[PDB]
Amino acid sequence: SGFRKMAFPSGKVEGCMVQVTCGTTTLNGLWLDDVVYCPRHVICTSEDMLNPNYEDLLIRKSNHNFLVQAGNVQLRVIGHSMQNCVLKLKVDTANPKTPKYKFVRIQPGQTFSVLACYNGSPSGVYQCAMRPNFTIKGSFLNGSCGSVGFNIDYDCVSFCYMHHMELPTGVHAGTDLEGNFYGPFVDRQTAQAAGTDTTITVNVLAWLYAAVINGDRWFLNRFTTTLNDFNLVAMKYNYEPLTQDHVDILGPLSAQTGIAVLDMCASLKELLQNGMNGRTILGSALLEDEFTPFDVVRQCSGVTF
Amino acid sequence: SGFRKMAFPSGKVEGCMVQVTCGTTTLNGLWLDDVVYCPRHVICTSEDMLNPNYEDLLIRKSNHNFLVQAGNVQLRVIGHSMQNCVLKLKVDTANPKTPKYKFVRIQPGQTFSVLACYNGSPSGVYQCAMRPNFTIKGSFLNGSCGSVGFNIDYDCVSFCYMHHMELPTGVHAGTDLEGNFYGPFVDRQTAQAAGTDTTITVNVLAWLYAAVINGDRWFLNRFTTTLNDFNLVAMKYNYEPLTQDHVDILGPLSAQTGIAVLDMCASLKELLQNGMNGRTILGSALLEDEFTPFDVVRQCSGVTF
Ligand SMILES: O=c1[nH]cc(-c2cc(-c3cc(Cl)cc(OCc4ccccc4)c3)c(=O)n(-c3cccnc3)c2)c(=O)[nH]1
Ligand SMILES: O=c1[nH]cc(-c2cc(-c3cc(Cl)cc(OCc4ccccc4)c3)c(=O)n(-c3cccnc3)c2)c(=O)[nH]1
């Protein structure tokens, strides 16, 4: 029992982190097989990032201008190319620690683990969610660019995120491992709106099921609702609309606890309309939306890797 | 910017986790050099744990009765001994992945990372605190015994915790790596009180400094206090007393933010007396005590490993 914001074990990713240097810029890269992936703004100076022409900046760069260091190991760069917003550096040595892996583009509302890195060295790991507006509320300092987010299924690392930018609002933006930004953002230091964020309704419900499984039951009430009525309330409190697809994903938690999804929606409705009245749920005084239904079943049933 | 409950990268510990089997009992062990450490109740049956005589139970066990498996690798057991509440199994092979390490006994209020494991396989990592009453509020299921807690300093893993028990209250108890329980607990399924817990005042203050560093400033007020007056309030709200030693550990955060420790105490006093009035601090609607001053400086300055 107990419920914690738990991250995937990071060892399989730690073995892939390298340092990438181009000119006077140093950041983090991801070394898989014989390719190193990193944000393309490694080729920019402080002035370039205000309005960069990456095509033109890269043309002034040759293979020997990229220094890639993996601990002591200096890697020899034998090719370079730009794919959307990431640079791909071909090296002459395959990473001996390459895990089984794939590149995935996650959906808004999905969670992943972040291995924050500086100068190629891992400093910490934490779990976060892709917001509905495609930002993430991370913990990143200067030098963290090229840190990656991932999930793990038994032995296969699914890389979903590479960190590129901190917006003036303090939230974070980045790409999938094909270099495509999540959300509307561009890798340029110029004004960019993230737009309205909402709460991930299906995750909140998943966490309420986790609370019930662990003994926190005070919020269960005598009411039910309909999907239509609930979505009226969701809209009023800037919650994402709940779909039948979401109801179905919640099916196994509903079965395990014997609480129909729509009954749990009614409990959530009453928490939104009346607040938590100075109480806590799973040690939290607000409604938590960073656990997916899969996360809750994983943590509450102890699946391993 | 941003502030997250961040855990140490777990790779160095993942390489040390093995499965230990004795009879029909299987749990987690820690393989360092040529020794495997695990809870001594691996030798108990379900009935034994109600009132075990570990000396007598171990006498019925021989080296070949302990099966130790590290992935595929079956380890050959050439010695066994009991040290307080842990078993030490001498194996004939040194773990090739042994990190630099030491065994440390932490103080109440200190934080560490937990690598939750099942059947020798890591499933997740999270950060927690040793409570003032020497329990931890973890996330552990049956089979998690022998999972370990640790800190990391550059390349040296300090192991501080091995998980042994879940109490009927749902909180968790365990030992240092010499087998000595934290707190009053014994490895026996019989009634055991944990006693009153308090909030870790110095950690709360550290987190308020983290909030200020990140831009959450609404809680700073026009008041100051004295150490004596603050400790009166702390006692009323079951906060740990603040000592001059604590004030000194907070010195660098005070210097960085220009906010005198006693001024921050006055802000904390007003939050305790008046509540948070429906506001949040660093995304939390309650006062958070699981970050030490060292944690806050580490996360806010990006030290790595
Ligand atoms: O050597 C290196 N140089 C640079 C970086 C670097 C670079 C950026 C960055 C990159 C681009 Cl292309 C545009 C941009 O715009 C911000 C903005 C957007 C919109 C409006 C105003 C400003 C920012 C950054 O955000 N961070 C950082 C800092 C703290 C936390 N997380 C990431 C680090 C690095 O890590 N290493
Ligand atoms: O094979 C295996 N067998 C057993 C275990 C095991 C064993 C215990 C345990 C061990 C002892 Cl000596 C005494 C005890 O008392 C509880 C109690 C104390 C006071 C009053 C009433 C009850 C419990 C346990 O707590 N957990 C567990 C379960 C869930 C989360 N975290 C840990 C697992 C295992 O992991 N693997």
Swiss-Prot record, chains A, B:
Activity modulation: Inhibited by pyridone-containing alpha-ketoamides compounds 13a and 13b. In turn, alpha-ketoamide 13b (tert-butyl (1-((S)-1-(((S)-4-(benzylamino)-3,4-dioxo-1-((S)-2-oxopyrrolidin-3-yl)butan-2-yl)amino)-3-cyclopropyl-1-oxopropan-2-yl)-2-oxo-1,2-dihydropyridin-3-yl)carbamate) inhibits SARS-CoV-2 replication in human lung cells. Inhibited ex vivo by michael acceptor inhibitor N3. Inhibited ex vivo by compound 11a and 11b.
Annotated phenotype, changing N142A: Does not affect ability to cleave and inactivate human TRMT1
Cellular localization per UniProt: Host cytoplasm; Host Golgi apparatus; Host nucleus
Cross-link (Glycyl lysine isopeptide (Lys-Gly) (interchain with G-Cter in ubiquitin)): K5, K90
Domain of life: Viruses
Catalytic reaction list: TSAVLQ-|-SGFRK-NH2 and SGVTFQ-|-GKFKK the two peptides corresponding to the two self-cleavage sites of the SARS 3C-like proteinase are the two most reactive peptide substrates. The enzyme exhibits a strong preference for substrates containing Gln at P1 position and Leu at P2 position
Domain Peptidase C30: 1-305
Cytoplasmic side: 1-305
Annotated active site: H41 (for 3cl-pro activity), C145 (nucleophile)
Self-association and partners: 3CL-PRO exists as monomer and homodimer. Only the homodimer shows catalytic activity. Interacts with host FBXO22; this interaction promotes the proteasomal degradation of nsp5.
Function: Cleaves the C-terminus of replicase polyprotein at 11 sites. Recognizes substrates containing the core sequence [ILMVF]-Q-|-[SGACN]. Cleaves and inactivates human TRMT1, preventing tRNA guanine(26)-dimethylation of tRNAs. May cleave human NLRP1 in lung epithelial cells, thereby activating the NLRP1 inflammasome pathway. May cleave human GSDMD, triggering alternative GSDME-mediated epithelial cell death upon activation of the NLRP1 inflammasome, which may enhance the release interleukins 1B, 6, 16 and 18. Also able to bind an ADP-ribose-1''-phosphate (ADRP).
Protein name: 3C-like proteinase nsp5
Range within the parent protein: 3264 to 3568 of 7096
